[PDB]
């Protein structure tokens, strides 16, 4: 049972690290999306004029 618990603990810690990496990926992608959105808004204003 101690072996099983050790395996579970190590796996869960590594999984937490993987989830942190996923959060980083999402943040980078969303920043790029925000810049694209600003560009699109400016293009729309230019079209309006």
């Amino acid at each position: 049972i101690a072996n099983r618990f050790t395996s579970n603990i190590k796996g869960l810690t590594q999984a937490a690290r993987n989830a942190n990496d996923g959060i980083s990926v999402a943040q980078t992608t969303e920043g790029a999306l925000s810049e694209i959105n600003n560009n699109l808004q400016r293009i729309r204003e230019l079209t309006v004029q």
């Binding site: 943040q27 969303e30 920043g31 925000s34």
Partner: protein, 49 residues
């Protein structure tokens, strides 16, 4: 405590609580710095849209 030295459940619980508070600390500081309630859409996306 007095029984065991290999682990410190008190330390682990304290670390978890510290991290939980730190999340809100970071959120509040970035919110104040930006001056916008909705930043990076980590929250209600209807407001962002």
């Amino acid at each position: 405590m007095a029984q065991v030295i290999n682990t410190n459940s008190l330390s682990l619980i304290t670390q978890n609580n510290i991290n939980k508070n730190q999340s809100a600390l970071s959120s509040s500081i970035e919110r104040l710095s930006s001056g916008l309630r909705i930043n990076s859409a980590k929250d209600d996306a209807a407001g962002q849209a």
